[PDB]
Amino acid sequence: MPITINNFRYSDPVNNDTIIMMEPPYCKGLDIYYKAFKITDRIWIVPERYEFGTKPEDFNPPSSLIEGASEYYDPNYLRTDSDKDRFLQTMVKLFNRIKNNVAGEALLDKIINAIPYLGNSYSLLDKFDTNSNSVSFNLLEQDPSGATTKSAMLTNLIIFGPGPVLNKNEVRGIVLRVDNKNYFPCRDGFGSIMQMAFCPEYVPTFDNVIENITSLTIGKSKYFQDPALLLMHELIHVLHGLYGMQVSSHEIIPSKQEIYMQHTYPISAEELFTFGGQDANLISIDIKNDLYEKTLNDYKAIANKLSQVTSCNDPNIDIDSYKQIYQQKYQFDKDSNGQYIVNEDKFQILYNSIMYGFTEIELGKKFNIKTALSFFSMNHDPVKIPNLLDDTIYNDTEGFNIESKDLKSEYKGQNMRVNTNAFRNVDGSGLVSKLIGLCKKIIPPGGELCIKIKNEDLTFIAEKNSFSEEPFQDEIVSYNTKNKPLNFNYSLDKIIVDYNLQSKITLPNDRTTPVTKGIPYAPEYKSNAASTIEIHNIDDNTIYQYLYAQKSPTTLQRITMTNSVDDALINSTKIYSYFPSVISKVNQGAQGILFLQWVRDIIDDFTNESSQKTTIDKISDVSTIVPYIGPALNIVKQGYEGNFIGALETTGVVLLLEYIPEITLPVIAALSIAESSTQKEKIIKTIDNFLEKRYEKWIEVYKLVKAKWLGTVNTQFQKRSYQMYRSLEYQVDAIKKIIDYEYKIYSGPDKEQIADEINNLKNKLEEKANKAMININIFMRESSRSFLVNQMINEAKKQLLEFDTQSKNILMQYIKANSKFIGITELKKLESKINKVFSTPIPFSYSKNLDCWVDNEEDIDVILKKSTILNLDINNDIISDISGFNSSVITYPDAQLVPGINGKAIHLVNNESSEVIVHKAMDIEYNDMFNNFTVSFWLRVPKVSASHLEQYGTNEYSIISSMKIGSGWSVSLKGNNLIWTLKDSAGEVRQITFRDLPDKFNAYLANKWVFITITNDRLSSANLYINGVLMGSAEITGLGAIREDNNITLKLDRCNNNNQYVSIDKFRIFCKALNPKEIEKLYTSYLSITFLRDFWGNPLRYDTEYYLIPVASSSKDVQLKNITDYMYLTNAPSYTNGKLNIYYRRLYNGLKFIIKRYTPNNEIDSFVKSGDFIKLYVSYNNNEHIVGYPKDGNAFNNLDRILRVGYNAPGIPLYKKMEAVKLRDLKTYSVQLKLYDDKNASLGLVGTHNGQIGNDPNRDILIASNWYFNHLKDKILGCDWYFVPTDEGWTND
Ligand SMILES: CC(=O)N[C@H]1[C@H](O[C@@H]2[C@H](O[C@]3(C(=O)O)C[C@H](O)[C@@H](NC(C)=O)[C@H]([C@H](O)[C@H](O)CO)O3)[C@@H](O)[C@H](O[C@H]3[C@H](O)[C@@H](O)[C@H](O)O[C@@H]3CO)O[C@@H]2CO)O[C@H](CO)[C@H](O)[C@@H]1O[C@@H]1O[C@H](CO)[C@H](O)[C@H](O)[C@H]1O
Ligand SMILES: [Zn+2]
């Protein structure tokens, strides 16, 4: 099953197998050859520049660009044999990187097996034709004689070095010249040789600014991209091309009229599907049906075409071999006559796998590589990665993000501020960008002031012509018209599951007859070179002057801040600012006495000013408004100067846009019926088809508006955040340059003492600028949402309501015409359901679908998924919402991460910095107010000591709360009592108080991971569950509206004990009250079997001391009789406390055991996986002694074998090979242990047998026996063990 990646040096000799002299497709018949290397089955590498259709002068750096982002040019790259070996070795390493993750392994398998069709639309119908440069390349071989032989070879991919532009990779199918037109076999189902132009050293950079998630220690920074993910991105284009599904229509063209509009190439639908995520919805659902149908016809043509084949130009080609291979590729079936036919069910699964399965984003997650969030996310200058072949910089299992160097966490290996060894800045000579000029008329104190703006800083505004209007035209319902799908998507996880099951299919030999037919026509290189700049002339100051005014000079000079934008543009020493408080304190030349106070007062003013939030009652679905956006960017209405909040009350969120798009829609034509010939059966079907196509209009039109929003509205709100981030950074850079000047002027005694606290206050500026961006991103995210949900979607609804009433006339006149046929009973019943349907509008969804019912009981996993509105997961030390609604999450400096039930968990200590905040998305803002809901999470709290129950036993502290004013819900603790509280608008209160059990070894709030679930039914009661079992209940009826805080806060609040902590994992909210059967499935979903677990519920680890306790006899510890002798059970001591109502068996007595790997490899993991072979040691007198059974040693009933600690009799072998497993009892944190001999025979599971050895007393002695294997379904069993390590959260009293 594993795919083989070949190794070679460029200097290795030609062998006519893995190393050849290739004549590439666009050189066919010219007898020009290049050394080529077979990286794997059907993939070649040619270390040469992609020079096809070019001239030498195209490779030099031009003066400017016509379109797009920055481009790096270097004609000397990949010239020498040395350069070529370097290129070859880097590619091999990147292919090995891809192979070593199963996601990437599945991608490579699809590409290899998706062989092109031996033929195309203009080839012979009865024949397979290998005589085309679309499918085959020639190659020159030698004999021992020295004479040569022209053969040919079939292939899927050929990888070349980069063309002129080094940082823009390309994938292209071979083009054929037919009737003086370009024909692409990679576009109508057949496929072809795909040619890639690739360069691994030069990569794009992106940043962190817009992201919903935010850490305050990470902050905002730039990142560079992993070459392996860039390679995989292009391999997705190769995959589409090979199945012949390359999309080349319905492009998104940028408008380029105004200054603010970005100049790019048209964005293909190909690119958007490959990148994935939300921006694949720029293509509206109707266009996806067009593309699906196109490919369905193309494949049907091939199924017909393949059937006619009885010959081939190559005599050696076995015709029947290829037929079964193409049947497999295309998922064709056979009719009983013997012809190939398209099964449409099997087609839909194949089509979605290719177009919507592999995407950059989804691969990024599987590989732990950081990606951009949107396609329109800002690119910066590319960087160079000149040490990919150093394993200390980039390895073939983690890339840059290596765990042993602490660079996996928070994707720090890609972070340009942290990992400064891994990159170098690109040389200035070869880098070129599109700049536009902007000149303004100014009065002398020559004629003008001109600035240059970068194309990357401009905004993308989509053309109106780029979006469909097919949902507005006439649509004819009939009997035989079909249902269209409204979901085009496919799971990468499913693709992996499919890849793991599918049986191997060997391909035929890829050597074939020579290529003589055709003429090579290489497409000419479309140059992006330019000689001049576009200059714009506007007399008013735009946003671009307002940002340029905030720039500081690069010189160690005194600076001042002003509120006059025209002054700051002229004077080099002056800077624009929009914080009045900050402007005063910095401009006054600092005080000689109390200099530290002056610097301290700068920070207080910057904090007060930059942190300002507000709301507007008339804009009810925007939680956060930042007032200073107007003064900073010059977004202002006339007669509202210095009053941005009034300007927003009057105009609405549309004030923030730089281009107002037309939101009015044409009339949606009513549904028409063409069904004259009618039986009674065919009428009822035509009524059902009429209702379905009516439903499909609402969804089609909704998704059309969303597409338009994404390309024309959302892109404008996105840039405003970058413009604010740039602005806030300009202000921080200035204030620091003021302090740097005034520090060097300052003359006092303690200058050297306070030095580091001055640098400590300069750091606090960037902290408060990042906290400001949290509000600004919430403002732009929710404004952009409000314009979609309200303004734009109301236009769709207006036309859709009119579409309903017009189509109801047409439906009930068709009913009138054929009303007679079973009237009395069905005509009345059929009319009743129609009036129910058409009266109800269909709701618009901005994110996931609010479905909190789900067809009575469809399926418990589906019910749980569908009803989820919040779900916190922790990936690579980042906490985020994965539910679908994508609520913003804020992680504060001292929120800590610890081992969890399946990954890592949140850990909260008792100070104000230890905090996690979820700002609820607007879609789920008020779902708690009147409706049912459920909250679930794993909890772990330490055993409260006898002292702290006396001190802090009456202190109630909350740990999770939505409460303001004070209304909401909260989870709180008080001594050993768990408390759920529910409080409404009018001050009504309902609580559940759960008294924990006195036996702390069996208690829920005594240092163990336990699963909490709290349901809330408004028409009855709220129920508290722990591990799926009901523990408490309280009545919720007679309770009004609940009006929460917009943030759900995870924090220790009003807790007096400064040493208190808790741990919370998998925090989740559902929009309904779960029943016990739904809870049980939720509880057990988290209990995996991959990793074993300790007594506390955390992952069991190697090289860690553990005390053993048998589950069946939990009041017993393990003791040694003597070294080299047996182990046995003893009564463990205990602690009782009458007045405080607590007691427990004392921990940490008995033998210390240690687990080690039986066959140590070079792993980073210290986690014990189920099935791992292990060696068990006892740690006695700080020495390690092996546990095992000696050959023919003492044993009860000849079958229960007595274990021996550190046995070493000279001759006799000791069997010590053990296997750690989890065979039973999934809810308990126990593990079993199987013993083996030298020949791999089971000596049994480890447990105990009652008896006697010598004249010792009667003891439960430790043994190994196969007896247990016939008893694994018993409720209690003697082979289950707790592994108990010492923990901060349990000390004996
Ligand atoms: C109760 C007991 O002594 N169990 C130990 C067992 O002893 C054997 C006989 O018990 C069974 C059993 O219950 O497992 C009886 C079944 O009918 C047998 N089933 C079959 C053949 O299909 C099994 C089976 O033979 C074995 O498991 C082999 O794999 O054994 C037990 O009744 C018998 O006792 C008397 C007998 O009553 C009488 O004729 C006369 O007095 O002689 C016998 C011995 O005094 O003895 C059988 C063998 O000695 O043997 C197994 C061997 O692995 C265990 O030792 C088992 O004790 C369990 O051991 C566990 C871990 O080692 C753990 O300590 C449990 O708590 C013990 O019950
Ligand atoms: Zn692409």
**DSSP string for residues in 673-711:** E---S--HHHHHHHHHHHHHHHHHHHHHHHHHHHHHHHH
Question: According to the entry, how was the structure determined?
Answer: X-ray
* Secondary structure E strands in 878-928: 878-881, 888-891, 896-899, 904-909, 916-919
CA distance 937 to 949: 25
CA angle 751, 754, 757 (to 5 degrees): 145
Q: Is the dihedral of CA 33, 37, 39, 40 positive or negative?
A: positive
Cα of 1278 from ligand 1 centre, angstroms: 15
Return the percent helix, strand and coil in the chain, to nearest 5. Answer: 30, 25, 45
CA distance 341 to 299: 9
Residue 1086 pairs with which residues in a beta bridge?
Answer: none
Ligand 1 pocket, 1247 CB below 6 A? yes
- 4 alpha carbon, distance to own chain's centre: 29
Residue to mutate (ligand 1; options 1200, 1202, 1235, 1267; most atoms within 8 A of CB): 1267
CA distance 242 to 239: 5
Nearest one of 870, 867, 848 to 1075, comparing CA atoms: 867
Cα of 1219 from ligand 1 centre, angstroms: 25
H helix or E strand, kind and range, residue 1067: strand 1061-1070
Active-site annotation holds for 234: yes
Q: Rounded to 5 degrees, what are φ and ψ at 1202?
A: -75, 120
Contacts of 504 (CB under 8 A, 6+ apart): 1
CA distance 1071 to 1059: 35
1054 Rama sector, left if φ>0, alpha if ψ -120 to 50, beta otherwise: left
Q: Are 588 and 605 in contact (CB under 8 A)?
A: no
The DSSP letter of residue 23 is E
Angstrom CA distances, 78 to 158, 830, 952, stand at: 17, 73, 72
Domain enclosing residue 871, as ranges: 860-1086
Residue 1284 pairs with which residues in a beta bridge?
Answer: 1107
Residue to mutate (ligand 1; options 1126, 1197, 1260, 1261; most atoms within 8 A of CB): 1197
Please note each residue after which the chain is broken, C-to-N distance over 2.5 A, or write none: 445, 964
- The catalytic position among 23, 71, 234, 675 is 234
For residue 215 the two structure tokens come to: 């850490």
CA distance 72 to 54: 17
Q: Rounded to 5 degrees, what are φ and ψ at 499?
A: -60, -40
CA distance 408 to 395: 12
Cα of 1273 from ligand 1 centre, angstroms: 18
Which atom, in ligand 1's list, is nearest to the CA of 1250?
64
CA distance 880 to 411: 15
CA distance 284 to 704: 5
- 91 alpha carbon, distance to own chain's centre: 26
CA distance 786 to 506: 55
For residue 29 the two structure tokens come to: 């018949």
Nearest one of 945, 946, 968 to 958, comparing CA atoms: 968
Contacts of 549 (CB under 8 A, 6+ apart): 565, 568, 569, 575, 576
Residue in the structure block whose two tokens are 């079939």: 154
Nearest one of 579, 577, 645, 573 to 616, comparing CA atoms: 645
| CATH number for the domain that contains residue 1035 | 2.60.120.200
For residue 1101 the two structure tokens come to: 């680890």
Nearest one of 555, 592, 561 to 575, comparing CA atoms: 561
Ligand 1 pocket, 34 CB below 6 A? no
CA distance 590 to 739: 9
For residue 1229 the two structure tokens come to: 């944190």
Q: What is the SS3 string spanning 1143-1191? A: EEECCCCCCEEEEEECCCCCCCCCECECCCEEEEEEEECCEEEEEEEEC
Q: Is the dihedral of CA 48, 54, 56, 58 positive or negative?
A: negative
Residue nearest to atom 67 of ligand 1 (CA): 1249
CA angle 484, 489, 493 (to 5 degrees): 145
Ligand nearest to the CA of 1248: 1
How many beta carbons lie within 10 A of that of residue 415, not counting itself? 21
Residue nearest to atom 68 of ligand 1 (CA): 1249
Q: Rounded to 5 degrees, what are φ and ψ at 86?
A: -55, -50
Ligand 1 pocket, 1110 CB below 6 A? no
CA distance 561 to 198: 48
- 34 alpha carbon, distance to own chain's centre: 41
Ligand 1 pocket, 1197 CB below 6 A? yes
Which atom, in ligand 1's list, is nearest to the CA of 1263?
62
Instruction: Please state whether beta strands 157-160 and 43-46 pair in parallel, antiparallel, or not at all (unpaired).
Output: parallel
Ligand nearest to the CA of 196: 2
Query: What are the start-end ranges of the H helices in 787-845?
Result: 793-817, 828-839
Residues 820, 823, 829, 834, Cα dihedral to 10° = 10
Q: Are 1050 and 1056 in contact (CB under 8 A)?
A: no
CA distance 852 to 932: 9
Ligand 1 pocket, 1265 CB below 6 A? yes
Cα of 229 from ligand 2 centre, angstroms: 11
For the chain, the first-to-last Cα distance in angstroms comes to 57
For residue 159 the two structure tokens come to: 């990888």
Per DSSP, the three-state class of 53 is coil
Ligand 1 pocket, 1267 CB below 6 A? yes
For residue 342 the two structure tokens come to: 């398209």
Cα of 183 from ligand 2 centre, angstroms: 21
Instruction: Using CB atoms within 10 Å of the CB of residue 892, give its burial: 0 to 12 exposed, 13 to 18 middle, 19+ buried.
Output: middle
CA distance 915 to 895: 6
Cα of 524 from ligand 2 centre, angstroms: 20
Experimental resolution (Å): 2.6
Ligand nearest to the CA of 236: 2
Cα of 1237 from ligand 1 centre, angstroms: 23
Ligand 1 pocket, 1244 CB below 6 A? no
* Secondary structure E strands in 397-508: 424-425, 431-432, 435-441, 448-454, 476-477
Ligand 1 pocket, 1260 CB below 6 A? no
- CA count, 13 A, side-chain hemisphere, 986: 6
CA distance 705 to 472: 13
For residue 1290 the two structure tokens come to: 């349990």
The DSSP letter of residue 838 is H
CA distance 650 to 928: 31
CA distance 554 to 539: 28
Per DSSP, the three-state class of 979 is strand
For residue 878 the two structure tokens come to: 């980042």
Instruction: Please state whether beta strands 1214-1215 and 1204-1205 pair in parallel, antiparallel, or not at all (unpaired).
Output: unpaired
For residue 400 the two structure tokens come to: 């840059």
Q: Is 263 annotated as a binding residue?
A: no
Amino acid letter, 1176: L
Ligand 1 pocket, 1201 CB below 6 A? no
471 Rama sector, left if φ>0, alpha if ψ -120 to 50, beta otherwise: alpha
Contacts of 108 (CB under 8 A, 6+ apart): 3, 40, 95, 98, 99, 235
- 942 alpha carbon, distance to own chain's centre: 34
Q: Are 1279 and 1232 in contact (CB under 8 A)?
A: yes
Ligand 1 pocket, 1278 CB below 6 A? yes
How many beta carbons lie within 10 A of that of residue 362, not counting itself? 20
Contacts of 520 (CB under 8 A, 6+ apart): 25, 26, 27, 28, 29, 30, 133
* Secondary structure E strands in 605-649: none
Per DSSP, the three-state class of 503 is coil
CB environment 740-765: b (16+ within 10 A), e (fewer): eebbeebeeeeeeebeeebeebbeeb
Residue nearest to atom 33 of ligand 1 (CA): 1197
CA distance 96 to 1130: 55
Q: Is 907 annotated as a binding residue?
A: no
Q: Rounded to 5 degrees, what are φ and ψ at 836?
A: -70, -45
Q: How many helices (H) and strands (E) does the chain have?
A: 23, 65
Angstrom CA distances, 873 to 161, 224, 847, stand at: 40, 25, 18
Amino acid letter, 158: I
CA distance 940 to 907: 9
The DSSP letter of residue 1226 is T
166 Rama sector, left if φ>0, alpha if ψ -120 to 50, beta otherwise: alpha
Cα of 710 from ligand 2 centre, angstroms: 19
CA distance 1024 to 1032: 5
Residue nearest to atom 5 of ligand 1 (CA): 1197
Contacts of 48 (CB under 8 A, 6+ apart): 34, 78, 84, 160, 161
Residue nearest to atom 22 of ligand 1 (CA): 1270
Residue nearest to atom 2 of ligand 1 (CA): 1197
Q: Are 698 and 834 in contact (CB under 8 A)?
A: no
CA distance 316 to 118: 14
Residue in the structure block whose two tokens are 């919507």: 356
CA distance 314 to 305: 19
For residue 1079 the two structure tokens come to: 């809870």
For residue 550 the two structure tokens come to: 């905030």
